[PDB]
């Protein structure tokens, strides 16, 4: 339960910061502090804003938005802007329908054709 993906760019500002690029895969090391987590991307370790990342659970895919999509709150359809990162379970090429994704504090159903797997 330690796997996350960076949603937003984070430029290191201070010693021990871990630079984040959108789509980076993070192993969480320490979540003692509510605001600043420690984790590892690739060969690097450091601190980053806890609110800049999204949990990736086993079985879930990570996606980047390639074609923007206007959502609707009453329908539970989440908006996607170009290059937005989101996470959810994909389906086969054969199945038709929106999938449920999470993107930080927003969540909802989205078209798979709006997305490219990363």
């Amino acid at each position: 339960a330690n796997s996350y993906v960076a949603l937003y760019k984070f430029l290191p500002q201070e010693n021990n910061d871990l630079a984040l690029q959108p789509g980076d895969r993070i192993m969480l090391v320490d979540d003692s502090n509510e605001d600043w987590w420690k984790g590892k991307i690739g060969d690097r370790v450091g601190f980053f804003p806890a609110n800049f990342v999204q949990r990736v659970r086993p079985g879930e895919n990570v996606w980047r938005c390639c074609q923007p999509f206007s959502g609707n709150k009453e329908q539970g359809y989440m908006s996607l802007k170009e290059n937005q990162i989101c996470v959810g379970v994909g389906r086969s090429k054969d199945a038709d329908g929106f999938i449920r994704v999470s993107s930080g504090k927003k969540r909802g159903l989205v078209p798979v054709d709006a997305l490219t797997e990363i």
Binding site: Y8, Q13, S32, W36, F47, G104
Partner: peptide
């Protein structure tokens, strides 16, 4: 895009 926390780093 959330604000980077104003709180101190650990």
């Amino acid at each position: 895009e959330p604000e980077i926390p104003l709180s101190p780093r650990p």
